[PDB]
Write a sequence for this structure.
């Protein structure tokens, strides 16, 4: 079983947005539109924008889940490595196995699927505040892409799903993630490789 990654705006015109953070050596999180790839440092704040054309109903939720990008690894549950799952960096709510956490949201729910064993993290959808045109979720990635016994240098995708109160699909978007020491350099390197 592999979760779908098919982009789907749905009835509410759901899609993600990313800040424009640049590629300075010091940047902690940066997004490449050309690669559809987020580059970030370990456990640092990753703002992800939620855009809609119309407001979805009360009880709508937003779920994040990771899958391996390569087809030969897609059936493997993405989880934290044997070191990081035991490093007692708990935030009180996220299970220590979970790669993706949501920062600063007390209504977070952390799911371990009883059938697929995949991890996900879900929060209620809130419409944009006064003076904002979108809503933002702050994500943290809790292992490096290179962590041995975990992602093990394999690329992952994050799948963001807009769901109704039963968990039915309303919209879907996705992006590749690399968790690394120097996001700014790595984004520049991979974008240069793409041009070449
Ligand atoms: Zn790790």
């Amino acid at each position: 079983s592999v979760p779908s990654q098919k982009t789907y705006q749905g009835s509410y015109g759901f899609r993600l947005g990313f800040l424009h953070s640049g590629t300075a050596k010091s940047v902690t999180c940066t997004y490449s539109p050309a690669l559809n790839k987020l580059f970030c440092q370990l456990a640092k704040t990753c703002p992800v924008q939620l855009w809609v054309d119309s407001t979805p109903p009360p009880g709508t939720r937003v779920r994040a889940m990771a899958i391996y990008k390569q087809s030969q690894h897609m059936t493997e549950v993405v989880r934290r490595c044997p070191h990081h799952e035991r490093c007692s960096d708990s935030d009180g709510l996220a299970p220590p196995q979970h790669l993706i956490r949501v920062e600063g949201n007390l209504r977070v729910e952390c799911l371990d699927d009883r059938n697929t064993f995949r991890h996900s993290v879900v929060v209620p959808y809130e419409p944009p505040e006064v003076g904002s045109d979108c809503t933002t979720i702050h994500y943290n990635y809790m292992c490096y892409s290179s962590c041995m016994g975990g992602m093990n240098r394999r690329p992952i995708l994050t799948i963001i799903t807009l769901e109704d109160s039963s968990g039915n699909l309303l919209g879907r978007d996705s992006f590749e993630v690399r968790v690394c020491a120097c996001p700014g350099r790595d984004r520049r390197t991979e974008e240069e490789n793409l041009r070449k």
Summary: Residues 183-195 form the longest helix (13 residues). The two ends are 36 Å apart (CA to CA).
